[PDB]
Design an enzyme around this catalytic site. Structure first.
Site, short mmCIF file in Angstrom:
data_model
loop_
_atom_site.label_atom_id
_atom_site.label_comp_id
_atom_site.label_asym_id
_atom_site.label_seq_id
_atom_site.Cartn_x
_atom_site.Cartn_y
_atom_site.Cartn_z
N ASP A 204 0.80 -1.22 0.00
CA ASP A 204 0.00 0.00 0.00
C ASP A 204 0.84 1.28 0.00
O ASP A 204 1.82 1.39 0.74
CB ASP A 204 -0.93 0.01 1.21
CG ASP A 204 -1.75 1.29 1.31
OD1 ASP A 204 -2.49 1.61 0.34
OD2 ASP A 204 -1.64 1.96 2.35
N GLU A 246 0.03 -1.10 -5.27
CA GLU A 246 -0.94 -0.05 -5.58
C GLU A 246 -0.13 1.22 -5.83
O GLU A 246 0.28 1.91 -4.90
CB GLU A 246 -1.95 0.14 -4.45
CG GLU A 246 -2.75 1.46 -4.48
CD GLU A 246 -3.07 1.97 -3.07
OE1 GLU A 246 -2.15 2.00 -2.21
OE2 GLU A 246 -4.24 2.37 -2.84
#
Ligand SMILES: [Ca+2]
Ligand SMILES: [Ca+2]
Ligand SMILES: [Mg+2]
Ligand SMILES: [Mg+2]
Lengths: 548, 548
Positions: A204, A246
């Site tokens: 993330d 991501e």
């Protein structure tokens, strides 16, 4: 031949997926009692949102303990059971490694605010786990991500007497990666879950690790170098496991999170840059955005795979489109004030598409026909709506709707007692939109989704095939080839709301029989100069193979 | 010019539509309240199933008083306020005149079975109101409509001690149209309701009035005389009222019921013959049988209008098809023996097509583009299902599903307390299928239906034009024109479950552009020999115009 290349991912949140204790929040025994649904849906690999101890100021992205299991969700025993049960069914499971920040509640940052030198004198080894400044004047050309909340990226900490960095919420202090010990902590957090048998991590906010003066503090080279170190570890110490990133950025910078055959980085990145152009093309009825942005993605290494997605637990994000494109995406998909949150739209797939099955089916086939492995937002495969009454991005995270009984089947607590209220308006409520009704509807969006996945699953070109756009001469009609091993696929989708005609340039294919993938019905063979006329119905898609 | 040629008809039973008072049975107060709904759905004319006093041994087709209202439904005063309120919105209302037979409970038959002369010698002027045999031998070369249940068309009356004749249930003794008082009585009954302002009649089971020895006792010349006399009376006394006929026969025989401009019979007849072949063409992915049967229809008188439909209160009827056509229909549409009654299939539209929107939409577009005035069967606009737990064809007559209230909103009586139990199964119950959810759901079948009805109004050639089939050269794809004043519609519709190519013969229309009816999207101009290559998605329909 990599497993994640032909995989199909499914994103869910243990806290919203299935209650087990009647507590109102979902848990791992709840998730475990539903693994037969996921496998029989056609999922291969579950991606689970953060499950660590957290105050849930950001629903678990403020992790307080990297090696624990948030109580709401049960015990580390429970977690190791779920991993056994999914593994028995042939499901991979990947978690969410929150590398850029921890909660302010983390023991580390509790220790860090004690200042650099301790009461007894000795060093305070956790002080430089985080990023401090004396007045907070460093890093000034940096955008603020959480727009409708934060006003600086530096916050004053009473006890520390200094300022600290956070790219996201103030209660999510950023970790300082110039600290060698911090890299070794995350490696240690990864190794813990990868020794229990997790098949990898979706990682993330990767672009935000390092920050440097005179840069936007996004995509820095020293940040990339941290990431290759993870890849380096996991390749040596866990051959097989999956790193999925991501990296929400422009196509030129995203591809770098793969980086190099000799210096590999992530195995998979998300194809963020195509997903807003998909929605855009539906309104402009002009698919040209999809090609232009797809053409800004250079080739990725042999191991590299794209993760294609339509929606997810975050808002629909307009951070990486032009200023005009964003203005347009609000105008068309966010008529209400409530609908927008920090450069984006907090709406689920089906509201966005006016609950039109044709359109839902259209974008799902493009999602299954674009190159990569597709991820599905939970609930979107039965057509779940949202609850824009819930604060910050939570209305898309309402609980899985399983049947028409109490709280949708999610819990036996009354809807007002659940962690998020299960949706029960007349359009998308669990009395109308639920999995039982769709296992018995021969024509439900659930069964169409699963059929679609069987249909993709029978044709390896969708995962591993190359991709080549063909000209059609009607911007509403989008067509492309996927060639791989034997077969060549031809995928032609109408992005406009009524019948469209189009002249496909099949010049390289003169004399092939184009046939339907669903049942092999024949269209004419290509001949002459290979200009192949077509008409399409409103929002149609043809999935075809070219025989020769 | 006639109002019925432009009308859209909605078939509905009062007893199952809306309840006003919570006694479990729908009524005229209830219905009156829902007239804004029909008005807005796009309906012009209500056809109301028999409202009369009855034992309801055949859902009120066994009449026991022609000039009154069945208590269950309200008073005659209720009826008048209903007609005032229905007229006030510009709706028309037609009733159901049951001419061929009454209930055994009707006073005439209770007088009839007294016998020829009374115990006081005086002669019973009510005995030959009916059709009396001393041994039940006459007319032996006829068939038994209610095959599943009646063994003979004669039944022994224990009281009069002789046989009476019925084409339907023994509880439905046939009327004796060779006795002039009966014709008087019938006209007198029609005049009762036409005096009250009712706009017309659906006359029930007209092929069976007159029975004649040595014949098949159906479509006899003598019944058409009787029917011509009815038309005469309407024409002369109440000009402008509609007469519609349930004439389920073969095409050469159905047109006889309009009977000539010199001496006319019915303004309208249901197109029974095209209905079975629509369903059949869709499982056979071949539309021949439609073109076939449409040619077998002669042109009808100027006044006459055809009345297309898909389903109705009755079963989907297969009497007028070949046995291999019947073998096919049973094998494709009735995988359970219960599903078949009286040479037909007793299922609603949505179960029949597997709840498949593209198929529900496809047959509905064909209903509206085929020539004539279309009938919607109540609840089919929302995709209602069937309840086979109910005997004899009542499984399609379940209560209207308005909202997910306690009984679907039909009554405050709870489900087990209604006349028929409102459907609550997972796929088709009111929790999932209902008017309120569809009024808010942008993409709901209810809404698609109001828009298509809307679009059929935009183009008067749909109600008034001619029919000309186009070649296509693909049995799956069916094409035809409708021409009327200035304009030429082109209606291309695919009956296959996957994409299909075609080659339309549009040589009469070279050099003009097909333009989309929905969005005015122009398609390429017809060139050359006018052979127009096209492609269609699964179960698609292209509604087009061909401009000046
Ligand atoms: Ca950072
Ligand atoms: Ca008769
Ligand atoms: Mg729990
Ligand atoms: Mg009542």
């Amino acid at each position: 031949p990599e497993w994640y290349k032909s995989a199909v991912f499914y994103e869910l949140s243990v806290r919203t997926f299935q209650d087990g204790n009647g507590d109102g929040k979902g848990d791992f025994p709840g998730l475990t009692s539903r693994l037969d649904y996921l496998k029989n849906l056609g999922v291969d690999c579950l991606w689970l949102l953060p499950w660590f101890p957290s105050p849930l100021r950001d629903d678990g992205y403020d992790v307080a303990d990297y090696r624990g299991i948030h109580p709401d969700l049960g015990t580390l025993d429970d977690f190791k059971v779920f991993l056994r049960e999914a593994h028995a069914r042939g499901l991979w499971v990947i978690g969410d490694l929150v590398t850029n920040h921890t909660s302010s509640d983390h023991p580390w940052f509790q220790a860090a605010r004690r200042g650099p030198t301790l009461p007894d004198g000795s060093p305070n080894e956790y002080h430089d786990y985080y990023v401090w400044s004396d007045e907070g004047k460093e890093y000034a050309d940096t955008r603020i991500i959480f727009t409708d909340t934060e006003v600086s990226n530096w916050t004053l900490d009473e006890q520390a007497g200094k300022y600290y960095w956070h790219r996201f919420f103030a209660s999510q202090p950023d970790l300082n990666y110039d600290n060698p010990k911090v890299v070794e902590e995350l490696h240690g957090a990864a190794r813990f879950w990868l020794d229990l048998g997790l098949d990898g991590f979706r990682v993330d906010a990767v672009p935000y690790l390092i920050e440097r003066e005179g840069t936007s503090c996004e995509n820095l080279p020293e940040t990339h170098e941290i990431l290759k170190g993870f890849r380096a570890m996991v390749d040596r110490e866990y051959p097989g496991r999956l790193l999925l990133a991501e990296a929400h950025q422009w196509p030129e910078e995203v591809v770098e999170y793969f980086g190099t055959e000799a210096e590999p980085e992530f195995h998979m990145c998300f194809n963020f840059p195509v997903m807003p152009r998909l929605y855009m093309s539906l309104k402009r009825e002009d698919t040209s955005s999809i090609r232009e942005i797809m053409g800004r993605l250079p080739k990725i290494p042999s191991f590299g795979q794209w993760c294609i997605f339509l929606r997810n637990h975050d808002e629909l994000t307009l951070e990486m489109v032009t200023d005009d494109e964003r203005a347009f995406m609000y105008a068309a998909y966010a008529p209400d004030a409530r609908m927008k949150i920090n450069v984006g739209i907090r709406r689920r797939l089906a509201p966005l598409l006016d609950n039109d099955r044709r359109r839902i089916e259209l974008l799902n086939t493009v999602l299954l026909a674009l190159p990569g492995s597709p991820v599905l937002y939970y609930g979107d495969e039965i057509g779940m709506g949202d609850d824009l009454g819930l604060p910050d991005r939570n209305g898309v995270r309402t609980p899985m709707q399983w049947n028409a009984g109490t709280s949708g089947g999610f819990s036996t607590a009354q809807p007002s007692d659940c962690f998020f209220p299960p949706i029960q308006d007349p359009v998308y409520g669990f009395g109308r939109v639920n999995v039982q009704s769709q296992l018995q509807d021969p024509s439900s969006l659930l069964k169409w989704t699963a059929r679609q996945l069987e249909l993709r699953r029978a044709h390896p070109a969708f995962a591993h095939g190359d991709l080549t756009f063909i000209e059609t001469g009607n911007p509403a009609i989008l067509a492309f080839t996927r060639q791989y091993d034997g077969e060549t696929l031809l995928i032609v989708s109408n992005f406009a709301g009524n019948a469209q005609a189009g002249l496909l340039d099949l010049a390289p294919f003169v004399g092939r029989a184009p046939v339907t993938l669903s049942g092999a019905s024949p269209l004419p063979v290509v001949t002459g100069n290979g200009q192949y006329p077509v008409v399409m119905g409103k929002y149609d898609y043809y999935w075809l193979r070219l025989n020769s």
